Every structure is written in structure tokens, then in C-alpha cells.
Design a protein around this ligand. Sequence first.
Ligand code: EGT
Length: 121
Amino acid sequence: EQLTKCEVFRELKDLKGYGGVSLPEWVCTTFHTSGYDTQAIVQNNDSTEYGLFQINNKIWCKDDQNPHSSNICNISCDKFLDDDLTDDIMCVKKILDKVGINYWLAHKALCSEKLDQWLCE
Ligand SMILES: Oc1cc(O)c2c(c1)O[C@H](c1cc(O)c(O)c(O)c1)[C@H](O)C2
């Protein structure tokens, strides 16, 4: 699913404020992470990143490329490619708990200013 900006804003409600990250910050960060494509996959021969949040199969979820992933989120990476972001968000919270927002390199570069582009009524 190719989400719109304010569909992301709505669907990410449960991340608002968690770990100090605002919802406009998440709307910006996801745009510059996956372009709002819930089916985005970025890969090389070592690792694969999945979905709206580009969660990786090195340590966060398990897949066929890396079946021995630590799988901290205790989930198949395939669950990050569907339209339901509930499990996505649960995993994002674990990422924030352990390594914080700089898992998403777009946040510092692109989403620490001009947050008024990322607002929804
Ligand atoms: O969390 C809420 C929940 C949703 O039901 C609404 C969401 C945000 O914003 C949308 C929206 C669309 C636009 O085209 C805008 O320009 C805008 O500001 C907001 C629209 O109101 C539906």
C-alpha cells in the first residue's frame, strides 16, 4: 500500500510521543525511509529491510535470508509488508527502547527541522 502523508499520521497514532518522538517527526522519517510504501524492500547480499519502517533481518525480524537473526521483535519480517502496522509499531518501540531513533538515519538529516511540512488536521 502506498500511503498518503495523513494516512501515515493517522495510522501511527500509537507512536505519538513515545521515546520523545513526535508524530510529525515520524511522518517525516517514514517518508524519507520507505517513501510511505508498506511493501518496500531494500536488500543486499547481507541483509534485507522491510516495510514502512525498513526494519532489518539482521537482528529485528526473521526471514529466509537470515534465519538465525536474533529476531528481537519475535516475528517474521513478512509481517512488516502488510497493511496492518500494529506489529510494525510494536517492533519500532523495541528499536527505540534499545538503539533509539538513530536507527533511522533520515531522522537527524531530514526530520530535525521544518516539521510544519508534516502536519495533518
Ligand atoms: O489523524 C487524523 C485522522 C484522519 O481521519 C484524518 C487525518 C488525520 O488527516 C487527513 C488529512 C488529509 C488532508 O488532505 C489534509 O490536508 C490534512 O491536513 C489531513 C484527514 O482529515 C483524515
